[PDB]
């Protein structure tokens, strides 16, 4: 119920602006906080703001730059981080809190009630590149067969793959992307379907790569 | 300032899984437990050290105070395959625990192995990638060997393994053998030999180039 | 003039009454003396004094200059120290002690009687102006949760010579 802005890539030293929207908004939230998660390490608190008092609060690693603005009008949150570092690359969560437990003043403290979808922020000097999608066709031989798609040579993460516009979910396995030697990421999504459905049942693989604004639908037919 | 022990847990369904959180400095009762399922945002399980959030089953049970906390999952279900975190809201800097990954144990299951030739579309670019799929197996430990004309390969394959499935508690693996178009059109048979505990014999899935 | 507000709250494990500061709070249903200087340490958050029209008294040093810390700062206090409106600014004050108890000092605006202007049995709770009505001010619901169901009326009240047009919450 909390939607965040799509994943981004920016060069070290540049700036990122990540938003947050509520559908349907707006509910009773007293505080807007942000919590990032680097793939290597556990969760880290970035900061927060209580819009009623306008008081902000950050951590030492982000004390100088980051600013969190919570718009109550449209119920839209915002975190802007400038002069990015390589260690800033993480999944940034937008989190809102209902019901305080302590107030130092101005700032108030409480448990985190609702989290956002997460936003992959990539700090890299590398160029943005769209992926190529290749069919992983079944071999035409229980009676359960497997088929998929190879999402290759893209930067940066992530790539989101669904099947038949989200109609086919059971039996779907999208593997964690692997970092190739070329510096590019590679990913594959498979699915197990009954053998007797190969010719008749259509299979479209829906691949999305937001950082390059790439939407590619690849039909997978047996041979 | 939070220490979660153990770092990794593995336990059968219907049994109790307990997680310890220890703060360097006293945090009274201002502690919260969160659950993070594979590929999703954390979910608020417990707040105030022992108070269940709305919509959370009674099997989840927070406990402890001061520097000493414990989270109890009494009747485990495959859905509980997640990494749990503890987070304090007392002292000036907000801190999270390291995080405990929870693995649900199940009956040993053999991997359904498949193999995929490179598409003719990829070959026009000049590269060839062959894909071996180990599907729905348990436990996680599994070996994959790429043979080309019965010759063992090395340093040319990259594998990727899924997080434990929420419903059937299985892992899936995908090994990818990458080589040039030229090298690809110099060999006929491409094989993937798989080793797993549930298999009394190494299973080999193969294909002939262009057949 | 929002900095002045004293904002020290602990603890909300039990009732989540604190939310009441920001919006309506899910309080349990149904559970339902001179004024001088109060230290800002035990106050969350706004302090309401009545003339009887409700008025806000912010933190100030003792005495008496205003402090724009959230109190917080040790010197911060609320100076009430008041005498009834013929002639004074207010009859009494209400605020919340940090644990979430409601502290009331002085006397309710009803007190003018006499008699019969104050509630029938007399008062633990509230700024009454009528046996059935109390003054309506923004943090009344937070301060007096039991009054959540009270109907609101536009009401004239006369004190000494001055006339007050004020809103009232009644049974
Ligand atoms: C909040 O108010 C309560 C009571 O109104 C305070 O607790 C009182 O403490 C005094 C002396 O410490 C006792 O004589 C009373 O018996 C207590 N009252 C109750 C109801 O137990 C409490 O100290 C106040 N909170 C703070 C932080 O001062
Ligand atoms: C809140 O109150 C309890 C007991 O009154 C105390 O032990 C604790 O230190 C307080 N918490 C904060 C945030 O100061
Ligand atoms: C306020 O009242 C207190 C207690 O009655 C008293 O000690 C102090 O002198 C008074 N101060 C003022 C502002 O008159
Ligand atoms: C608190 O008030 C004192 C005077 O009592 C003042 O000197 C000081 O600046 C205040 N504290 C802060 C950090 O503002
Ligand atoms: C007032 O009415 C509400 C419903 O509008 C009810 O839920 C609540 O309990 C009532 N308040 C009290 C304390 O009687």
- Contact between residue C26 and residue C141 where contact means Cβ atoms under 8 Å apart: no
Which phi and psi (to 5°) does residue B68 adopt?
Answer: -125, 115
For chain C, report the end-to-end CA distance as a whole number of angstroms: 34
Q: How far apart are CA A179 and CA C125, in angstroms?
A: 67
Instruction: Copy the structure tokens of residue B52.
Output: 């269940």
Cα separation of B134 and B175, whole Å? 8
CA distance A59 to A47: 6
Greatest distance between any 2 Cα atoms in chain B: 69
Determine the Cα–Cα distance for residues B50 and A193; give it in Å rounded to an integer. 45
Asked if A163 and A135 touch (Cβ cutoff 8 Å), the reply is no
Closest approach of A19 to chain C, Cα-based (Å): 23
Separation in Å, CA of B32 to nearest CA in chain C: 12
Strand partners, C149: none
Residues C7, A30: C-beta atoms closer than 8 Å: no
Q: How would you class A130 by CB atoms within 10 Å of its CB: exposed for 0-12, middle for 13-18, buried for 19 or more?
A: middle
Neighbours of chain C (3+ CB pairs under 8 A): A, B
Please give the structure tokens belonging to residue C93: 């004050």
Which residues are paired to A43 by β-bridges? A37
Query: Cα separations (Å) of A177 from A10, A214, B42?
Result: 20, 17, 21
d(CA B21, CA C148): 41
Cα-to-chain-centroid distance, residue B113: 19
Nearest residue of chain A to residue B130 (CA atoms): A136
Tokens in use for B142?
A: 């599994």
CA distance A57 to A106: 9
C80: Cβ contacts below 8 Å, ≥ 6 apart: C35, C36, C37, C38, C49, C57, C90, C93, C105, C106
Question: Chain B residues with CB inside 8 Å of A192's CB?
Answer: 112, 135
Neighbours of B87 (CB within 10 A): 25
Structural domains in chain A plus CATH codes: 1-125 (2.60.40.10), 126-223 (2.60.40.10)
Nearest protein Cα to ligand 4, atom 6: C73
What is the rounded distance in angstroms from the CA atom of residue B100 to the CA atom of residue B79? 15
Of A82, A84, A83, A111, the residue nearest A96 (C-alpha): A111
DSSP collapsed to 3 states, A97-164: ECCCCEECCCCEECCCCEECCCEEEEECCCCCECCEEEEECCCCCCCEEEEEEEEEEEECCCCEEEEH
d(CA C96, CA A182): 64
Within 8 A by CB and 6+ apart from C21, the residues are A100, A103, C9, C44, C45, C139, C142
Asked if B99 and B20 count as a contact pair (C-beta separation under 8 A), the reply is no
Structure token pair of residue C170: 């009644």
CB pairs under 8 A between A and B: 118
Q: Which residues of B touch A185 (CB under 8 A)?
A: none
Question: Considering only CA atoms, which residue is closest to atom 17 of ligand 1?
Answer: C101
**All domains of chain B in start order, with CATH:** 1-106 (2.60.40.10), 107-209 (2.60.40.10)
B138 closest CA partner among B161, B120, B119, B159:
B161
Q: Which of A189, A187, A223 is nearest to B207 (CA)?
A: A223
Burial of residue C169 (CB within 10 Å: 0-12, 13-18, 19+) is buried
Pair of tokens at residue B129 = 């990638």
Question: Would you call A86 an interface residue with chain C, using a CB distance cutoff of 8 Å?
Answer: no
Query: Does A130 reach chain C within 8 Å, measured CB to CB?
Result: no
Sign of the CA dihedral with B177 first, then B182, B183, and B188 last? positive
Cα separation, A177 vs A162, in Å, equals 15
* Least Cα separation, residue B48 to chain C (angstroms): 6
Give, for C133, the enclosing helix (H) or strand (E). Answer: strand C133-135
Instruction: Write out the two tokens for B205.
Output: 């899935």
Let me know if C101 is exposed, middle or buried by CB neighbors in 10 A (0-12, 13-18, 19+): exposed
Closest ligand to C-alpha of residue C106 is 3
**Dihedral sign (CA B143, B148, B150, B156):** negative
CA distance A167 to A96: 31
* CB half-sphere exposure, C46, CA atoms < 13 A: 18
Question: Is residue C24 a contact partner of residue C17, using CB atoms and an 8 Å limit?
Answer: no
Chain B contact for A160, CB < 8 A? no
Dig out the tokens for C13 from the structure.
């494990």
Residue of C22, C42, C70 to mutate, testing the A interface (most A Cβ within 10 Å of its Cβ): C22
CA pair distance C138, A121, nearest whole angstrom = 42
Three-state secondary structure string covering C59-114: CECCCCCECCCCCCCCCCEEECCCCCCCCCCCCEEEEEECCCCEEEEECCHHHHCC
User: C4: closest CA among C49, C70, C63?
Assistant: C70
CA–CA separation, A140 vs C142, rounded Å?
70
Closest Cα to residue A97, out of C96, C101, B89, B28? Answer: B89
- The conformation of residue C128, written as its DSSP 8-state character, comes to B
- Of B91, C18, B34, the C-alpha closest to A31 is C18
- The distance from CA C32 to its chain's CA centroid, rounded to whole angstroms, is 19
Query: Between chains, do B133 and A132 touch, taking CB under 8 Å as contact?
Result: no
CB contact under 8 A, A134 and B122: yes
Asked if residues B115 and B192 have their Cβ atoms less than 8 Å apart, the reply is yes
- C43 near A CB under 8 A: no
Among B28, B31, B49, residue to substitute to test ligand 2 (most atoms within 8 Å of Cβ): B28
Cα separation, B114 vs A213, in Å, equals 32
SS (H, E, C) B78-143: HHHCCEEEEEECCCCCCEECCCEEEEECCCCECCEEEEECCCHHHHCCCEEEEEEEEEEEECCCCE
Instruction: Name residue A79's beta-bridge partners.
Output: A18, A68
Residue C28: other Cβ atoms inside 10 A = 11
Task: For residue A202, report the phi and psi dihedrals to the nearest 5 degrees.
Answer: -70, 140
| Under 8 Å between Cβ of B150 and B187 | no
């Amino acid at each position: 119920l909390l939607e965040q802005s799509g994943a981004e890539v920016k060069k070290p030293g540049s700036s990122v602006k990540v938003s947050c929207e509520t559908s349907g908004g707006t509910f009773d939230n007293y505080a807007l906080n942000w919590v990032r998660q680097a793939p290597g390490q556990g969760l880290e608190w970035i900061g927060g703001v209580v819009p009623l008092f306008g008081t902000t609060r950050n951590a030492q690693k982000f004390q100088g730059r980051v600013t969190i603005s919570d718009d109550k009008s449209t119920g839209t949150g915002h975190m802007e981080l400038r002069s990015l570092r390589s260690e800033d690359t993480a999944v940034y969560y937008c989190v809102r809190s209902v019901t305080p437990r302590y107030c130092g003043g101005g700032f108030c403290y409480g448990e985190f009630d609702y989290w956002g979808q997460g936003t992959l922020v990539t700090v890299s000097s590398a160029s943005t590149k769209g992926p190529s999608v290749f069919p992983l066709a079944p071999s035409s031989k229980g009676g359960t067969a497997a088929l998929g798609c190879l999402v290759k040579d893209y930067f940066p993460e992530p790539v989101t793959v669904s099947w038949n516009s989200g109609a086919l979910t059971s039996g779907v396995h999208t593997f964690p992307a692997v970092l190739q030697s070329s510096g590019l990421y590679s990913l594959s999504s498979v699915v197990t379907v009954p053998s007797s459905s190969l010719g008749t049942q259509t299979y479209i693989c829906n691949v999305n790569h937001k950082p390059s604004n790439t939407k590619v639908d690849k039909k997978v037919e047996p041979k | 300032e939070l220490t979660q022990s153990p770092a990794t847990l593995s336990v059968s369904p219907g049994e109790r899984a307990t997680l310890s959180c220890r703060a360097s400095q006293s945090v009274s009762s201002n502690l919260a437990w969160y659950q993070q399922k594979p590929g999703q945002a954390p979910r608020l399980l417990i707040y105030g050290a022992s108070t269940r959030a709305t919509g959370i089953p009674a099997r989840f049970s927070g406990s402890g105070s001061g520097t000493e906390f414990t989270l109890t999952v009494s009747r485990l279900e495959p859905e509980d395959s997640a990494v749990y975190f503890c987070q304090q809201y007392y002292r000036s800097p907000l801190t999270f625990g390291g995080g405990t990954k929870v693995e649900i144990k199940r009956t040993v299951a053999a991997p359904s192995v498949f193999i995929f030739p490179p598409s003719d579309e990829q070959l026009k670019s000049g590269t060839a990638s062959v894909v071996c799929l180990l599907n729905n197996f348990y436990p996680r430990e599994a070996k994959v060997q790429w043979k080309v004309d019965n010759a063992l390969q090395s340093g040319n394959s990259q594998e990727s393994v899924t997080e434990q499935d929420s419903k059937d508690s299985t892992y899936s693996l995908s090994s990818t053998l990458t080589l040039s178009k030229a090298d690809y059109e110099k060999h006929k048979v491409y094989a993937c030999e798989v080793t797993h505990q549930g298999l009394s014999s190494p299973v080999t899935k193969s294909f002939n180039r262009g057949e | 003039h929002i900095n002045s507000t004293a904002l020290n709250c602990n603890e909300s494990l039990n009732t989540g009454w604190l939310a009441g500061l920001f919006y309506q709070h899910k309080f349990d249903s149904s559970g339902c003396r001179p004024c001088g200087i109060v230290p800002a340490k035990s106050v969350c958050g706004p302090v309401y004094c009545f003339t009887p029209s409700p008025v806000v008294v912010g933190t100030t040093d003792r005495s008496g200059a205003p402090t724009y810390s959230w109190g917080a700062n040790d010197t911060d206090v609320f100076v009430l120290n008041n005498t009834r409106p013929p002639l004074g600014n207010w009859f009494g004050c209400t605020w919340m002690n940090s644990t979430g108890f409601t502290k009331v000092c002085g006397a309710p605006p009803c007190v003018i009687g006499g008699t019969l202007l104050c509630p029938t049995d007399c008062c633990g709770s509230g700024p009454w102006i009528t046996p059935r009505c109390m003054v309506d001010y923004p943090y009344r619901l937070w301060h007096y949760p039991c009054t959540i169901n009270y109907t609101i009326f536009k009401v004239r009240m006369y004190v000494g010579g001055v006339e007050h047009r004020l809103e009232a919450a009644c049974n």
